Structures are given as C-alpha cells and as structure tokens.
Scaffold this active site. Structure first.
Site, PDB file in Angstrom:
ATOM      1  N   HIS D  42      14.311 -51.370  10.759  1.00  0.00           N
ATOM      2  CA  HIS D  42      14.308 -52.715  11.315  1.00  0.00           C
ATOM      3  C   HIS D  42      13.404 -53.642  10.583  1.00  0.00           C
ATOM      4  CE1 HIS D  42      10.496 -52.286  13.635  1.00  0.00           C
ATOM      5  NE2 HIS D  42      10.943 -51.083  13.945  1.00  0.00           N
ATOM      6  N   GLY D 144       3.436 -55.239  15.836  1.00  0.00           N
ATOM      7  CA  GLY D 144       3.073 -54.973  14.458  1.00  0.00           C
ATOM      8  C   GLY D 144       2.673 -53.537  14.200  1.00  0.00           C
ATOM      9  N   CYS D 146       4.613 -50.870  14.387  1.00  0.00           N
ATOM     10  CA  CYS D 146       5.663 -49.967  13.950  1.00  0.00           C
ATOM     11  C   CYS D 146       5.407 -49.469  12.551  1.00  0.00           C
ATOM     12  CB  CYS D 146       7.057 -50.561  14.113  1.00  0.00           C
ATOM     13  SG  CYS D 146       7.531 -50.855  15.885  1.00  0.00           S
TER      14      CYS D 146
END
Lengths: 5, 298, 299, 301, 5, 299, 5, 5
Positions: D42, D144, D146
């Site tokens: 993503h 933030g 990930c």
C-alpha cells in the site's frame, strides 16, 4: 498407449 | 506485431505423395527417385499394436505398393527399411525436386509442418521442438508421413516426418535417417514423455519482440549473468542459455542486453500480476530468435 | 501440452505464383495477378499523408508501371482506380490462375495472409477479422498488397489486401472491390480504431475444444440464454452470439449446451481466479468454430 | 514481586536495518537486508484508493525513480521492484553493511516476539506481543507505523516474522510475513474485516500457573486432575485453545512436582471464577507469555 | 498517425 | 570584494569521464591517453560486496564483460591491471581530449575540486579540504564512485583523488591515482572509525587574512605569538602544527598583519567569539587554503 | 559499517 | 472499517 498416426 | 509465421509450401506440395500397402494409406515424401515414408505402412490393425517389423518386411512383394502423385502412379523399383522409415526407389525421377538437405532439429528450433492426408496437403502450421522431443501439432488419423521443414536460403532442410501421438496429446516422429527424436518408438505402447523445459532463448526473443512492439514494462535495472541464470534455470524449469548471435543482434537493435532480460525472467517467474506481455500471461517460448528477427528486422 | 489445435494456414502453392511486384516512380509494392488482371493498392501512385488521388491519377501514364512476375515484365494495357485499389489490365493471362472468387470477411471469421515483399512471398499466417475491422498481423515496409484468402479444397476466395497500419501491431486493408474494411481509408492521418469486441462464438468453440480435451472445470449447472446473453454482451465487450451449425455440432458431441457456456463466459469475465484453460488466463477468440471443428473432427 | 516481565529482545541488530520508503506523497517503514528492502505494498496507494485498491493497476503507474528510500540521511537507489503478496521487494544498488544473520519465519498463535515500532524510518520503541488465535496482536501503532517489524532472537541470529499493516479495530493489529502473506484471513483493504474468534492460549496460561507456583502461590492446585484429551474436548466449547505437547511445560512439571493434568483441572475450576482471589495479582487468566518465556526468565536460558 | 504500408 | 568556495572549471575534466560496468556494478572512471582508472570494487556484486575477495574476483574476470561508455561511444578494453584499490584498464582508443596532467597526492589542509558523476555523466562539482583524518566532507550518493578530485596548476591538471567510501561519520574518502587509500582506509564495508580531526591552522590564518582584507579586523590586537609557542599549544588544543608558508608571507605583506599577530588572535578566539561574527561565521573556518584566499583576493 | 559508493 | 496503518 501412444497412437501411430 | 508478431505471429507464428509459416514458410510458403509451393516447393513442398509437389513432393507430397500417398503410399499404400495392404490396408494402410498414409503419406510420403518424393525427392529425386526416392519416396520416404513411415515403415509402419506395412502393418494392418492387428500387428498395429506391437508390430513385428523385421518379420513384416519378408512378406513384402513390391506390386502391393501403390504410390500416387495426384492421379499419377509411380512404379516402385526397390525398397529399404532405414530405422522407422521405408525408402522406396521409384523409376520416375521427381521433376519438381527442390534443392534440399536432411537435418535434425534441436529443442527450441522451430519449423513448418505440412499436414497432408491421403497424399494431398491440407494445411500447414508452425511448431517448436520441445525438450521432450515432441511438438504441439494438429494431427488426425492419416496424417503420418506429413513433413516438417525449414527454408534456409535457396534450400529446403527436411527435419521431421510425422508418426506418433503420445498419451499427453503432443506429437513426435523421425528425422529423415529414419531415426526418432528422443526415446520414442513406432509402437502403440505406453511412452511417457519427459518433463519439458521452458525454452529460454525463445523467451528472451519474445521479450525483444515485446520491446520492439513498445511493451517494455518488465525491463528494469537488475542484471543477471548467463552463468548465474543457468545455475538457477535447472532448479526452475528453464533450459540452459547458450550464446546466440540473433539475440546479440536483438540486443543491438533495442539497446537491452541479454543480462537485463535474464533478470526480467527471474522476476516474471513469480507471476505477471495479470499485467500482460503481447496479450499474454505466461511465458511464450514457441518463437525462436531467428523467427522474431526475420519478422521484425527482415 | 497439447491441445490438437493450432493456427493452421491453408497451403500456399496456388497463390504464390499470382504475386507480382508493381512499381511506379520510386515506389514498389505487391500486386495480385489473376487472369489478365493485376490488383494492388492505389497509393502506389503516390510520392502521402493526405493524397488527392484523382490529381495523382492525371500524372499517371501507361508505361509508367513496371509489373514483374519473377524476372518477367508484364505490359500494362489499361489502368483504372476502383475505391482504394488499382486494377491494371495486362497483355498476359496468368497461366497459374486458380479457380477463384472475391469475397468479404465478417468479424470473427479467419483467413490466411501471404506476406510478400517486392513480389516475393515470405510467409503465411492465420488471422481473425476483428470487430474493429482490423487484423493482428506482421507487416513491415513494402508489405502492401499482401493477400488474405480462404481455401475450399480447389477454389480460392480472396478477401483482403493489405494497406494500412493503424497503430503498433494493428492492421487493415481493402477487399477486392477496392473497398476498405470498417471505416478506414488510405491516408496517413489519425484514424482511431472502432472499439473491439471479444468474438463470442470463437470463445465458445474454444471452450468446446477445451471440454473435448478433458478440461471442463468452468462448466457449471447454470445456463444463460442467447437473448439474455446478447443484452449483456453490449455492456461488457462481447459480440452478439448468432446461430451456428458448428457450435450446434459440438454441443451435441460434448453434451454441453451453448447456453451452459454462455453462463460460463459471464462467470469467467469476472476472473479466471488462477485457473487456466488450455494454458491461458484469458479468453481465446482467435479460432472460428469451423477451425476448431475441422482440426478436431476432421473436414 | 514475581520475577517475570514482558521482555523484549535487544534492538541493536534490527535498528540499522530500518529505512523509510516514500512513494508519491506517502511515507512508511521498510526492512533493509542485504540488497533487499521489504515494505508494505500500500505504499503505492494515494488515499482515494484505500478502501478497495486495485493493486495490479497501481503497479502499472509505478516507475523506478518513483521510490525514495532513506537510511538515515543516505538515499538508496532502487534497481528493481516486484509485488509479492501484500509487500514490495525493492532491490537496491547497495548491500546493507549491518545485515545480520537472519531468517524469515512464521509465528503460530501463542508464540511471542518483539515488535520494533518505527516512524519515518526512525525506530521508537520495542514491545512484547503474543500472536492470538485471531491472528492478530495487541500492539501500539499510530499513523506511519506500517512496515514496523516483529522478530525473534536466537543469540546471534534474527528470525523476522512480522511486518505491520493493519488495524482491525481499536488496539487490534495484524500484518504480513516476509513472503508478503497476511496472517489469518485478513488483507490490505480498508473495509469491514471482522476478526476470527479469539481463544485463551492454554499452554501460556499453564506456564503462568507454573510461575505462580514457583513464586509460592498455589491455592488453585487441588487434588483433582483432568487429562489432555478430556481438556481438549472441553476447550472448544469454552474459549480455549487445544493443549499440545510441550517440553518446557514438562520441565516445569518436573521442577514443581505439579503435573500438567493437575493444572488443566485447575483451569476448568478457574473458568467458573477466581472468587475474589488473585494469581500473581490478576483476577483473569494471563496468557501473554509463552512457556519458554517463563522458563527463560526463571530458570535461564 | 496511421501508416501506409 | 568577498570570499567563496571557488570551484575550478570542469571543461578539461568532463570529456575524460567514462562509465565502467562489470557484471552488476556501474560506476565512473577517468580516461586519459589509452588508460581508464576506476575503483577495483567494480568487479563485486552485492553478494560479496561486504567483505569482497579481491585477488580471487580477479581470476574470473573475462575482458568482454567490461563495458566502458564515453557518451554513447563504447571503448574496447585491450588489457587490465589491479593496482592497490583501482583497476587500470587499457583501451584501444587513445582519448582525443586528454589534458596535460599529472598524478599527485594532497596533504591535510590542501584543497581541491571534486567532479561528481553518475553513470559516466558529470552532475556537479564542489570544493573540498583534505582533513587530518584523511577524509573529506563531500556530497555523494550511490553510483558516485570513481568521481575524481583534482587541482588546476597552470596549464596542467593534477589528479589527486578517486572517491570510494562513505564512513559511518558521514564524511568521505578514497584513493590517489597509484590506487592507494588516503589514511588507513580500505575498500570493505566494515567498521572504520576515523581518527580525530585537527583544525587546519594555516587555513584559519588564511581566512583571517581574508577577513582583514574585507574590512573585518576586530580580533586583531597587539599580542603576538611565535610559531614555536603556538605549536606547543596547538597539539594540546585540537590545532594542527603551523609550518612556514609563502602564501601567508605574501598575505602578511599585503595586509601588514604578521602571522604572529594571528596566532595570538587564534589563542584568544579559541575561548569563543561571544557571538561576534567573523565573515558571517561563529566558528573557525578552515576549509580555504592560503592559495585559495590569495587567488581570490589578489589574483 | 562503512559504505562503498 | 479496518484501517491501513
């Protein structure tokens, strides 16, 4: 089997 | 774009004859005063499963042979069995004998087949000799003795004479010394073909066709040596890569080195993610380098 | 693999000796010589991206054409423009002229193209007329005049003359009345191709080949009718299914009905998952019913 | 009191492997090992996707110098990208000189590991977590985070087992392994994904009972016994995972003289209520520490 | 844009 | 005026910048006569790129795998040798734009220009000072290796530097053109702590003479300090030894302000500036050498 | 710990 | 409902 043409 | 380009058949059609003996009608090839055909023309369905060849030969009387070239009827002087073909001598030398040689095709090399039935050509198709020494053709009963061939210059290189459909649906036959490609034989017995390799230089070639046809999305900045690819290739279903002047010439045309394309192959082997290359989702390996080249440069 | 089905081309020997080179000014391309006619694209009289062909015609005089059959020079006795082709009558009857007719190909129908450069045949390949009224061939410079035809044992039906490339790998040309397929024309300007449909009946045939080859995982208990399918076709990028005796014959052979596979197609549109049909993850529409049937069943 | 904590493996070998990967207007974290960097896929969304991204189409708009990857102030050049499951593997021009001995692996429910939470490529803290039967973990992740990584040590060697991606619901977390494959049935889309039903991790509770006993808190040990077969029949119905064999529990069984089947019975009784009494100061089962966590902190290992 | 062969 | 980090022009150096590739790595080389110089690490992949086996990588080296681009041109490598940490490859084509040049070696405090290149293609250039630690403060990304440092002395180019290494501190180092590393460094991705750095005293004196020349002499007083006593002190306080220097002598002539006066100012200023600025600065500036300030202020 | 460029 | 971090 295989087949002869 | 790119297509499976078949060679023209005019030099080859007039050489196509029918051969009959007893029951069986199949096809043969007439060059000079020789007609080539599968030796099993001398079986009936009765020996037809395990035929006794050396023994069938003995009962053979010439006059029982019947070889038509159109309405014409060649008369057979003598005959010999060479591996799995018969080589029959006829009295009439063939007026339309092209300049020709005999050869032998290796995995990945491609050629044209002229399918015939009863001595009469019906159509033709382009094929690739596979690792297993079989081809993916289109053959019905009566197709045996159909010929495969390549055009090299002013000359015809005969390369395949059609004989056997394996239990997997793919085909194989003999070269013109009467010898079968691979381990196969002229008997209606179990014959499992070996595993098949993806024909790597073929894939490289199609990847250049793609580049040339403005489809290079897979080209990145990783590189892979032919040495390291080969090591990898064994383990993953790919044939070994070998030096190839046509690819060299494709690398020249496009700027994209062979090594770049080896990397793309290792990546793409993980799947394409429904991105297509030349409207396709798998590796295409049915086109040789010389095929893509002939077509895209001339 | 292997499925018993290929792109089969009609043998080429009856057509090759009808291929000629036609030269005008500094420009050479290919023509087709039948009886005492030779047919070729009219842009041979160019020296073109927007030709005024009638004015071009005026500067044409008679010994301006060189027509070679191998090493033999044919003398042209008259020229006329018909649509986008020239018909040049010559002094000489082509002794190799086959039984022939001129005809047309509807989208989905297939034929063979004999690619030629400078009068000299190079190779042949199988093509499908698209809904876009284009074909996917392999033509370089100097290929114009290459011919597409269909056999019929002894008789040749000529259906296409190569003229034009729309875009990388996308091709079109005229029939033998000199008339472009679809709306295209012989000018080097933007010509955006008509939208192109999946050829439904060809996919169906291809599904039939697959079932015969013992690959039938997409056959389910559901059915969708032709009327229903045709409503849905429009919206989804598929051509109208029409009646078809070959599909009928395969329906009977396999015991799977045409409407069973219409339903199957609808499901397959929404994805193949990861499953393959005769080794592809897309519909194959490049082979007509009668191509599948002739390769498998023998005609 | 007690001797047992949520112990994390020290972070010094993982921290220099954490990078930032930036694409478009979006930054998250990556793990850099040899000449590979791993990060969530993503990263190639722009936030009028998130909800139902068509990632293959997104991939098409990806070109090469579209990626900025930072290790501290040093910009890495990406030499190739491929999508594998729900992760990108970005090959770079440079070998990470800090790459440790490592492997990639998987965590079964009940197993624990450390998470190194990072933002913008910069590590912030580490914490202990248990993989649940829901195939989720209870972490502490903001925006933030990930690309944060979960791992297990082995003295010198690092086994990497998790890459953070997804919050199912307030304080409920999941992510992928390093084949890029989500744990449990989840996937990277911002839609309703209702978590698999979660079980008490039975062996972990057992380890916790053995710690309690070692610490001289054994009021729940009674004269009754319940076998593993019997327990496992009953587990299904009552919200507990199958007891499997386990050499650490066996070792604790021997040390304490209290048998696994003695504590299985105890668990059954304890399900119907702690009736006021506490075990190492809670009134609930504690299942967040594996057997070998308990054994390593008390017996060392 | 279209090309005449 | 003024003073700036004046970079030498790049025109004589640009046409010498080539790309060098072998297997995986692409970096930069310098082409002079029929030799191209480059880091020897060009023959590693990532796989061994941490601690590489050099003597052993050499053996597998087959010429044809080398690829040396000068623009779109492509040189043919005749032979090759390993000299310390560079490869010296011979090419067939003598470089038509070879400047007159020598090879040298800079010492701490000496400055030079670096031409950063990527993929054989120059990108920018900047002025640096060699530090005590035998490192420089550059600006370098991946792909920059083999970018060259050099000085212009008259009608000649003195090549002096070849970039190879970014230390853990953020500073940079490389080799002179005999393939030898400045200081104790080496071409391996292993811990290498740079030694402590000295403030480069003659350079500070130089910047102080620049300040005087630019009407900023507030720090000049009437105390004096001998080079002998300064040196003794310098040692203990993070300053390099002062050595006789003809450019400073020439600066003392221009301005009237002796070297000894400036050594005193330095000992004072070392106690801090009290937010007084010198040339808009609050620290000692030691990146300009005497000859830099001189070139710029006198000519 | 150092990085070759 | 689920949120991608």
């Amino acid at each position: 089997x295989a087949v002869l043409x | 774009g790119i297509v499976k380009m078949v060679s023209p058949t005019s030099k080859i059609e007039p050489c196509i004859v029918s051969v009959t003996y007893g029951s069986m009608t199949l096809n043969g090839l007439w060059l000079d005063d020789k007609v080539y055909c599968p030796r099993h023309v001398i079986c009936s369905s009765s020996n037809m499963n395990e035929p006794d060849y050396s023994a069938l030969l003995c009962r053979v009387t010439l006059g029982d042979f019947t070889i038509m070239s159109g309405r014409m009827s060649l008369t057979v002087v003598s005959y010999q069995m060479q591996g799995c073909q018969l080589v029959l001598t006829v009295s009439l030398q063939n007026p339309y004998t092209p300049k020709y040689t005999f050869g032998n095709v290796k995995p990945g090399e491609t050629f044209t087949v002229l399918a015939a039935y009863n001595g009469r050509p019906q159509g033709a198709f382009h094929v690739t000799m596979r690792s297993s020494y079989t081809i993916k053709g289109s053959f019905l009963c009566g197709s045996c003795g159909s010929v495969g061939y390549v055009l090299t210059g002013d000359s015809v290189k005969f390369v395949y004479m059609h004989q056997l459909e394996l239990s997997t649906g793919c085909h194989t036959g003999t070269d013109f010394t009467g010898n079968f490609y691979g381990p196969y034989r002229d008997a209606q017995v179990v014959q499992l073909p070996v595993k098949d390799y993806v024909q790597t230089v073929n894939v490289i070639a199609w990847l250049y066709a793609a580049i040339l046809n403005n489809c290079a999305w897979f080209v990145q900045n990783d590189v892979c040596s032919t040495e390291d690819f080969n090591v990898w290739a064994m383990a993953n279903g790919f044939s070994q890569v070998k030096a190839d002047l046509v690819l060299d010439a494709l690398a020249s045309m496009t700027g994209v080195s062979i090594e770049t394309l080896l990397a793309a192959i290792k990546r793409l082997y993980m799947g394409f993610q429904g991105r297509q290359i030349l409207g396709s989702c798998t590796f295409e390996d049915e086109l040789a380098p010389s095929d893509v080249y002939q077509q895209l440069a001339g």
